[PDB]
Amino acid sequence: MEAVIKVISSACKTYCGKTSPSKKEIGAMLSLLQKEGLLMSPSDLYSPGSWDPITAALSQRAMILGKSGELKTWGLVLGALKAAREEQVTSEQAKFWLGLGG
Numbered sequence: 001m002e003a004v005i006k007v008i009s010s011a012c013k014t015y016c017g018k019t020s021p022s023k024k025e026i027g028a029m030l031s032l033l034q035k036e037g038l039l040m041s042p043s044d045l046y047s048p049g050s051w052d053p054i055t056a057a058l059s060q061r062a063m064i065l066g067k068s069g070e071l072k073t074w075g076l077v078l079g080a081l082k083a084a085r086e087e088q089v090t091s092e093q094a095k096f097w098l099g100l101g102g
Contacts, residue, residue: 001042008045015080015084
C-alpha cells in the first residue's frame with residue numbers, strides 16, 4: 001500500500017497541481033476502501049471498473065455517517081486518473097516505466 005500512495009500522489013501532483021491531496025489523506029482513503037471490502041487489492045482502484053462503485057460507496061459514507069474526508073480526496077484522485085487516462089497513450093507510458101526499471 002506504500003507504492004500505491006506514491007503513484008497516486010505523483011499522478012495528483014501532475015494533474016491537480018496545488019489543490020492536490022496529501023499522502024496521509026490518500027492513505028486514509030485507500031485504507032477505508034480496503035476495510036469496507038471495496039478494494040481487494042489497492043491496485044484495483046487504477047481500473048475504471050471500480051470508479052462508480054467507489055464514488056457510490058463514498059457518497060453513502062458522507063450522507064449516512066456524515067464523514068466526507070475520503071470522498072473529497074477521491075474527487076481529486078479520480079479527476080487526476082481521468083486526466084491521465086485521457087492525455088496519454090496508456091501502454092507506451094507503461095513501456096516507459098518498465099524500461100527505466102531495467
